[PDB]
Amino acid sequence: SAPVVGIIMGSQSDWETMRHADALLTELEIPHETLIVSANRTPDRLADYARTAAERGLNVIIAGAGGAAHLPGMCAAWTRLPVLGVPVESRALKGMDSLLSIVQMPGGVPVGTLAIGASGAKNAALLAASILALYNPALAARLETWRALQTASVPNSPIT
Amino acid sequence: APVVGIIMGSQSDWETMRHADALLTELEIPHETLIVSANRTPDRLADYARTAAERGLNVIIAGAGGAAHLPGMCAAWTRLPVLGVPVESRALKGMDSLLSIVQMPGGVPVGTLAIGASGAKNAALLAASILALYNPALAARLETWRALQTASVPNSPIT
Amino acid sequence: SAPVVGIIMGSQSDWETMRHADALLTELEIPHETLIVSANRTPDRLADYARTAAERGLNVIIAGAGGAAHLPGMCAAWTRLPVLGVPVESRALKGMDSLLSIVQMPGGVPVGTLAIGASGAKNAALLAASILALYNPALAARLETWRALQTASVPNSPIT
Amino acid sequence: APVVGIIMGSQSDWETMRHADALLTELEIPHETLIVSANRTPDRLADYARTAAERGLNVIIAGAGGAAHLPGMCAAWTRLPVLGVPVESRALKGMDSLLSIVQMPGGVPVGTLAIGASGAKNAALLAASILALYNPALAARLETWRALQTASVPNSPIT
Amino acid sequence: SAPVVGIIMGSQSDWETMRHADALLTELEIPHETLIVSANRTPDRLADYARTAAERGLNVIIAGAGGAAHLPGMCAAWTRLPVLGVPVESRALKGMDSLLSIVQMPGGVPVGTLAIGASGAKNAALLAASILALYNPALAARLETWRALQTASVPNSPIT
Amino acid sequence: APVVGIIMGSQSDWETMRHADALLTELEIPHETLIVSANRTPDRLADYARTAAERGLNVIIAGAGGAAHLPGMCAAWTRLPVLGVPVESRALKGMDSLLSIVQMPGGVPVGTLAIGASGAKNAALLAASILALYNPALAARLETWRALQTASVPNSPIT
Amino acid sequence: SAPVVGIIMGSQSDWETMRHADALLTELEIPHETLIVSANRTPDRLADYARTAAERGLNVIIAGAGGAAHLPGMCAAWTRLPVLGVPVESRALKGMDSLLSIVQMPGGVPVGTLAIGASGAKNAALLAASILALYNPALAARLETWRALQTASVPNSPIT
Amino acid sequence: APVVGIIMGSQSDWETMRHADALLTELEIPHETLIVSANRTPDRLADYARTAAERGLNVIIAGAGGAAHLPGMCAAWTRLPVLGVPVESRALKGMDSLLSIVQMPGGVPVGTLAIGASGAKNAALLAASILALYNPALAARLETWRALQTASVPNSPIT
Structure with a gap:
């Protein structure tokens, strides 16, 4: 039941985007945790979360934030x-x-970055899955x- | 046998992608370093990518510009997992x-790193951090x- | 009846844009086919479509996609x-x-690119027509x- | 007799547009290479463009910057068909x-290629691919x- | 009654923007004409309009277009x-x-350019006025x- | 007596604004060429701008960067009328x-020209075209x- | 009661943004004044406001404008x-x-600049507060x- | 004892941030000048920032790129108050x-200055203007x- 991926985001307003990462991990049966951690409002919360992630058994972090x-x-x-970054769309x-x-x-300090918005959130989860799939x-x-199934499900022509 | 594949669109990308190659060598990660063009050698790319897992690759680092x-x-x-390095274009x-x-x-992710040499170095580090999990x-x-990176940062600038 | 232009697009969501290319080819009585082909979800479908296009009698490909x-x-x-590209507007x-x-x-590998959006779709069809018109x-x-008629139909003053 | 016209806004564009000229020559496509400025010689452009078809041109490649x-x-x-080459501006x-x-x-298309020399080369290739149809x-x-392009891509980078 | 400023625009869709130039010239009692002239659909109309403008008694042209x-x-x-250019906002x-x-x-070929949109249209008219005002x-x-009056009419504090 | 004022924010702008100065001299338009900084000499600017008309200036060309x-x-x-030249910033x-x-x-127009030397030349030409009206x-x-500009454009590029 | 911060803005249309600076100063009990001053319509008003600010007892100016x-x-x-600048979002x-x-x-002439829009207005007030807090x-x-309290009030997980 | 802290992400930032250092020295503002990387030395940054006020710092000027x-x-x-200097990236x-x-x-402000050397100089001036209040x-x-800045601006450009 223990989480192997952590999804963190800077605010509740990021959830509309980051929920797509949550949904996909659940779809693929990847146990995970989902938290709000603000780099600018809760820097010590972030420090503690990130420095203890590995010892807590996390394998991948997906981090979403905007601006x-x-x-x-x-x-x-x-x-x-490995940390995967989702750029949340800004106003x-x-x-x-x-x-x-x-x-x-x-x-020296990588973040594997995905597309702006919901696409990026979904792909952060998929990228995390492909990392975990290695073992x-x-x-x-x-x-x-x-x-x-994704490949097989693409239609051959538009509904014109 | 290689567990990371570094591929790049052209010889002109090597000035950037050599940083990925060097980092993997530094960490003693067996890897292959190849030119594969999506636009000039699409069948080469198809074969490379479709057979990568069966050949034992775990991560692909791909660099291209434009x-x-x-x-x-x-x-x-x-x-x-495919990691992408944006090569600086003219x-x-x-x-x-x-x-x-x-x-x-x-539906089709690429974990993307910074433009240029920094991105190439970081793709290799990110690949390392993936492999390190097992x-x-x-x-x-x-x-x-x-x-060593952290400990080596100076405390004050030199003139 | 056989198609001489192929219109391909990455998704059904591209059709709102690419339909303008379809309409214009039909207006000019240019036989064509219209398909969904995803570069990222159906790469082998794309490979087969593109490598066989000439032997199937296509003369021009109009390809639309976004992001x-x-x-x-x-x-x-x-x-x-010749391949003509339509940039579909992204969110x-x-x-x-x-x-x-x-x-x-x-x-070494050209794509003749048109404007973002519906203008580009319409102009891809017109450009294709002007290519076919040569023979x-x-x-x-x-x-x-x-x-x-387009030239003759421009009004001389605004409805002020 | 020329079947492609290459036109450019100024001598300063030639460093870029010479790549189109070279490619057409390489493929033995008869063509003319001219300076025509939309802003400094608008009547020259009007006459050139309006008479192009009657003079037997099939494709026009036009390059300009700014x-x-x-x-x-x-x-x-x-x-x-007019193909456009964006010249790199300062x-x-x-x-x-x-x-x-x-x-x-x-209503008025221009098939546009990449900024710079790549675009100039590709305008000539695209013109070639059009002419090749007949x-x-x-x-x-x-x-x-x-x-040859495809076969000539190396498999690995040189140091 | 004879026009001394010409307002030209590429399409009826530009009028929502260019009407602000028309209104301001009228406000300042500057006689003018307002026309649609398309550079891309009616290039010969444009050639004739521009080459004869001076002999027709125009002193300034305000030209608005988008894309x-x-x-x-x-x-x-x-x-x-002198030609003043208004960039019409594009989609x-x-x-x-x-x-x-x-x-x-x-x-070698100037266009005095104003702001994107209605501000630019209004300022093209004002700039034209300031040119005509010289004589x-x-x-x-x-x-x-x-x-x-514009200066005197700025409020001293916001309606908070 | 000057009928055009050329003002620029700093000596560093002169490399760009000298093109305006040269064009006005070429057309024998009497003018003054000054450094006036909006940010470093705001009172100098206030006095310059408020008194320009009374001093007999007809057009002001102002160049600055950043x-x-x-x-x-x-x-x-x-x-x-004020014409503005965007100076290329680093x-x-x-x-x-x-x-x-x-x-x-x-409510407060600036007729703006291209970034850089082209814009400086064109501000002077636009000023000329204004003065030419009377x-x-x-x-x-x-x-x-x-x-002469139109007639002097070559017909073909030199190698 | 005397103001120690001046909030100035170019137009009433800036108030929707700049009100956030006003609210925050009031929240922190920082006396201030709020004015419209247009750089382009009331340049002499601006000159007088800025040159006399210090002698009037102002310590910080927050200036908001767009375009x-x-x-x-x-x-x-x-x-x-010190002058703090808020970029007001433009259309x-x-x-x-x-x-x-x-x-x-x-x-040689600094403006401490904050984020585009309401965030920037709020942060201009907070930055001003942190300056005043020094003495x-x-x-x-x-x-x-x-x-x-801001730090303590960040939630630990999203309302998923 | 220092009342301004200048911190920068790396030695490569010094070419830019030295302008802040010089200005503070010119105005006889006691300060410290340090390398602190948010990404390579995050604990160093945490300690530096959390203890700054207790160490008697009044203003922090922080420069970084990318x-x-x-x-x-x-x-x-x-x-x-933290003032930020965007260092020009490649x-x-x-x-x-x-x-x-x-x-x-x-909720968490940074007073931001111009990209590059201008921004570094202006961060130091802005820090000065803050300290000047008391x-x-x-x-x-x-x-x-x-x-002196205002009085020293020339009236006309040199050739």
Whole structure:
């Protein structure tokens, strides 16, 4: 039952986006936890979350935030685990501030960044799954089936 | 046998992608380093990506610039995690590279790193952090690498 | 009755845009086919579509996609035919990701790119028509009439 | 007699547009290469574009930078397909060029290629692929060109 | 009664923006004409309009267009008169394509460019007025009064 | 006596604004060329702009880079037409300059020209075209200038 | 009762944004004044406001404006006080013109710039408070309590 | 004892941040100048920021480039005013730096200055203007500095 992925986000307003990561992990039967951790309002909460993640048994962190989106990169600063970043769409700049704040990490501290918005959340979960699948054969088979069905389900022509 | 594949769209990408190669070598991660063009050698890419898992690869690092299709198309054909490095382009400074890699639609992920050499280094570190989840000796070398990075930052600037 | 232009798009959600290409080809009496082909979900479908297009009698491909819009460029990778690309408008980045993903093809593999959105779809069809018109006199006359009427139909003053 | 016209807004565009000229010569496509400015020689452009078809041109490749009106205005006067090359500008690196060319409204197309030398080369290849539809010898030379490009990509980078 | 300013625009859809230039010229009692001239659909109409503007007694042209906005620059190519350009806001790119298509004229062929949208239309008319005011004392006094009243009419505090 | 004032925010702008100065001299338009900083010498700007008309100036050309307030603030204090030249900035290549100049709200216009040297040259030409409306000798020199520009464009590129 | 912070803005339309600065100063019991001052319509009003601010007892100016947003930088040109700038979101360019017009001040004349929109207004007030707190112990304690409560009030998980 | 802390993410930032250091020295403002990386030395940053007030610092000036988290994370841990300097980055010319610093959400401010050396100089001036509110001797030196800047602007450009 113990979580192997942590989904963290900067605010409740991020949940409309990050719920797509939660749903997909659940779909693939990946146990996980989902939390609010603010890089700017709760920096010590973040420090503790990230530095203890590995010893708590987490394998991957998915971090979502918008605007001056420091949460994924600061999480990666404190954990040796892979951290995946979801740029949450922002009001004025449409997530371009989110995206650049996350993806442009300096050499030495990676964040694997996904697309702005719900696509990115879904793909963070899928990327996490593909990481876990490397060591978990049952999950690898579920993921294979999932990817194959996605391919097989694309229609051949538009409803014109 | 290689467990990471580094692929890049052209020789011109090597100045950037060599940083990924160097990091993997530093951490003693067996890997292969190849040129594969999504646009000029699409069948080469198809074969590479579709057979990667069966050949024993665990992670693919793909770098390209401009209309950079290599990472996303690699991901389309493999179930393995694909990490993408936007190579800095001449006119648009890798913004075209970045958007063509990172903005993958839901269903086919590419874990995207920074534009340029930083991104190439970080793709290799991210690959390492993935492999470390099920390779304890590597996990310890990665811990050492991260600890040395942190400990080595000077406290004050030199003039 | 056999198609000489192929219209392909990455998803049903592209049809709201790509229908304008379909309508214009039909207006000019250009036989064509209209399909969904996903570069990221159905890469082998794309490979087969593009590599066989010429032998199937297609002369021009119009490819529409949004976001990380790889469909036109990957189509061009596998066919020797001219490929025309329509950047479909995306939600966050307003088709700028679509545009750059399509137009910035490296030297050696062209995609003739049109405007973001419905304008681009309409112009992909018109550009395809002007290509076909080079060898098809009846079509050339229909296109001449069409262009002339467009010019003649512009009003001289606004409804102020 | 020329079947492709290459036109460019100024001598400063030649460093970019020479790549189109070279490619057409390589594929033995007869063509003319001219300077025509939309803003400085608008009547020259009007005459060039309106008479292109009657002179036997099949495709026009137009390159310009900045507020780049040359391709679109060419297309306004000819029924021929017009391909546009955004020339890299000093300050905005061809983003002004790109948007002023690609964003043509419905009714007057310009098939737009990448910013810079890549775009110039690709405009010539796209013109070739158009002409190839009704010139079998050229179609075979184009097939050879594309096949050589694909076959010539190295498998691994050189240090 | 004869017009001294010409307002031209690429389409009826530009009128929602360009009407602000019309209104302001009328407010300041500047005789003018208002026309649709498309650079891309009616290039010969444009050529004739611009090359004859001076001999018809026009002193300033205000040209508004959106997207690949060639109308102001091509007008300036054919007239020696000052040409003022209004970037009409575009759907996807919010007038950034309009703006760059107008303002980035090469050395030798100026277009005096105003803000994206209605502000720009209003300011094109005001700029035209300030040009005409240089030789027309009655207009100069009307413009002085107008500018002074604008300054005097700014409130001192917000309605909080 | 000067009828055009060229003002610029700093000596660093001169490399750009000298093109305006040269063009006005070429057309024999009497003018003054000054440094006036909106941010460092705001009172100097206030006095310059408020007294420009009474001193006999007809047009002001104002160039600045970065957060470029000089043209707009000049326009705030004078009834004269103000033309603005966005000077290319180091990091953002004049996009900051452009937006801070062109986006004036309704009520206080600045006629804005291209980023850089092209814009400086064109501000002077636009000033000339304004003055030409009520100076026939100048109008004829401007006609000659435009005619020479058009006639001098080559027909084909040099290698 | 005398104001120690001045909030100025270019127009009534800025108030929807700048009210957040007003509210926060009032929340922290910081006396202040709130005015409309237009850099482009009332330049002499601005000159007088900024040059007399210090002698009137103001310690910090918060200046909000949009578009070609010159108000904060021109205020800073005339006062030795710290000036904080709020980029008000603009219609077409989403405050990017506002932001660049404010933040890119040349060396020698600072404006401390905050985020586009309401966030920036709120943070201008908070930044002003943190400046005043350096010399005002009661305010420093109120601000400490405010920051601590903000941190303590972040939820631990989303309402999923 | 220092009353301003200048912190920067790396030695590579020093070319930019030295301008802040120089200005503070010029105005005789005691300060410390340190390297602190948000991403490589997060615990160092935590300790620095949380203890700054108790150590007697009044203002922190933080400079970083790229995904620039240093100013915002500093502000997260201190009640002191934090001023942020976007360092110009190689590919995106500090636009990534700017947006990652300036776009702080309501509740945790960073007063942000221009990209590059101008921003570093202005962060130090802004810090000075803050300190001047409760240090009359400094206020007078700042007045002198601003007056000299204004008086020293030339009236006309040199060729």
